[PDB]
Design a protein around this ligand. Structure first.
Ligand SMILES: Nc1ncnc2c1ncn2[C@@H]1O[C@H](COP(=O)(O)OP(=O)(O)O)[C@@H](O)[C@H]1O
Ligand SMILES: NCCc1c[nH]c2ccccc12
Ligand SMILES: [Ca+2]
Ligand SMILES: [Mg+2]
Ligand SMILES: [Mg+2]
Length: 361
């Protein structure tokens, strides 16, 4: 039987009894966030594979607040294998300056649904920086967009090149990653409805998004690329130099359309720009498209990226609770209109023309 990784005592018993770790019980902290995972920071008296501080993520089989939303615990072995694969390809993915990194994966335990990784440090997320007042310095925002765009383009390039390598093909079988995207797309119609939008085109839009995520083998996608999954390490003493970017939360990593990653991050940039700081969100979006387009060996499908941004806006706007109710309803309608532009006869849609302008050489 399993240990109880949802409680501090069960976590300490698991670490000491099942893994023989030497735990500093005063340094065990429950980390906030997550409705489907319980995350702990653990200080150790003795190093575990060279680390004296670790993070443990425990995957639950459902949302804590809604046990009818099912999500398979096997996603956790894909997160472990994904950060192993990124570390095995870090020199090329991290580029000529090595700013973008991922945490090192130390252990995955099947029967306890427990993933242990390196604690890359107590850090604020990009989401914290862009919602802080005053916001993230525009110079850092540009660098962040540039470095993330380059990392993602290099991830998509190598995913295409090594598609049939076994260690890559593994992620085509992250059925929880694919299914979870399916389930998230299914919230598009209810979220629009909530804001008084009954668009009978939306069932057709959703079916296309779902068929693509369930079946696409295009490339390796990080699959949860928004500001809440990105850590910024700023210089200690100098809060104006970016030293590292850490990309976390790879449990949905799968093969899928390249436009899925672009839709996540660019969609988040649209929410940021709309509701937090226009220059921050816009600088980040433009630098991301510039860097991604230049590094990617494959054409951006601007219609599918438009639909991805649209899906992100509908799926996430109410969740974020930014701005007023009226502004959110207008923003969601703009997302719904973008869906119609993506199925249009032309690239003249508002969002599509912005993507083209900002990605241009
Ligand atoms: N390897 C790590 N090092 C340091 N902090 C981490 C690490 N992994 C997770 N965290 C912390 O836990 C939070 C949630 O992690 P994440 O993997 O996004 O969990 P979830 O899948 O529940 O969203 C992060 O924003 C970060 O504060
Ligand atoms: N971000 C809240 C939506 C959600 C529910 N289950 C998930 C699993 C993975 C990622 C997001 C979710
Ligand atoms: Ca239409
Ligand atoms: Mg997360
Ligand atoms: Mg997650």
């Amino acid at each position: 039987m399993a240990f109880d990784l949802k409680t501090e005592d069960g976590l300490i018993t698991y670490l000491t009894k099942h893994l023989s770790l030497d735990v500093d019980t005063s340094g065990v902290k429950r980390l906030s966030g997550g409705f489907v995972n319980v995350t702990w920071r653990i200080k150790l008296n003795a190093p575990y594979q060279g680390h004296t501080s670790i993070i443990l993520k425990h995957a639950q089989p459902h949302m804590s607040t809604d046990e009818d939303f099912k999500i398979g615990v096997e996603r956790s072995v894909y997160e472990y294998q994904a950060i192993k694969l990124m570390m095995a390809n870090r020199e090329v993915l991290g580029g000529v300056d090595g700013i973008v990194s991922v945490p090192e994966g130390l252990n995955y335990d099947l029967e306890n649904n427990a993933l242990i990784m390196q604690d890359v440090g107590k850090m604020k997320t990009l989401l914290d920086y862009v919602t802080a007042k005053p916001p993230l310095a525009t110079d850092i925002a540009r660098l962040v967009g540039t470095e993330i765009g380059g990392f993602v383009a290099r991830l998509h390039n190598i995913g295409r090149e090594r598609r049939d390598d076994p260690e890559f093909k593994f992620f085509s079988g992250n059925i929880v990653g694919r299914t979870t995207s399916d389930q998230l797309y299914q919230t598009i119609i209810p979220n629009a409805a909530k804001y008084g939008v009954d668009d009978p085109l939306l069932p057709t839009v959703v079916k296309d998004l779902v068929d693509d995520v369930m079946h696409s083998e295009e490339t390796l996608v990080m699959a949860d690329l928004w500001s809440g999954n990105i850590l910024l390490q700023l210089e200690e003493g100098n809060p104006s130099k970016l030293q590292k970017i850490y990309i976390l939360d790879w449990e949905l990593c799968k093969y899928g359309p390249a436009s899925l990653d672009l839709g996540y991050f660019l969609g988040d940039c649209y929410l940021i720009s709309r509701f937090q700081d226009e220059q921050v969100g816009t600088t980040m979006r433009q630098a991301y498209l510039q860097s991604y387009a230049r590094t990617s060996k494959h054409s951006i499908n601007y219609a599918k990226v438009t639909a991805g941004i649209a899906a992100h806006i509908v799926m996430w706007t109410d969740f974020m609770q930014w701005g007023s109710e009226e502004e959110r309803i207008n923003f969601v309608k703009k997302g719904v209109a973008a869906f119609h532009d993506a199925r249009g006869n032309n690239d003249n849609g508002e969002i599509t023309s912005t993507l083209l302008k900002e990605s241009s050489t």
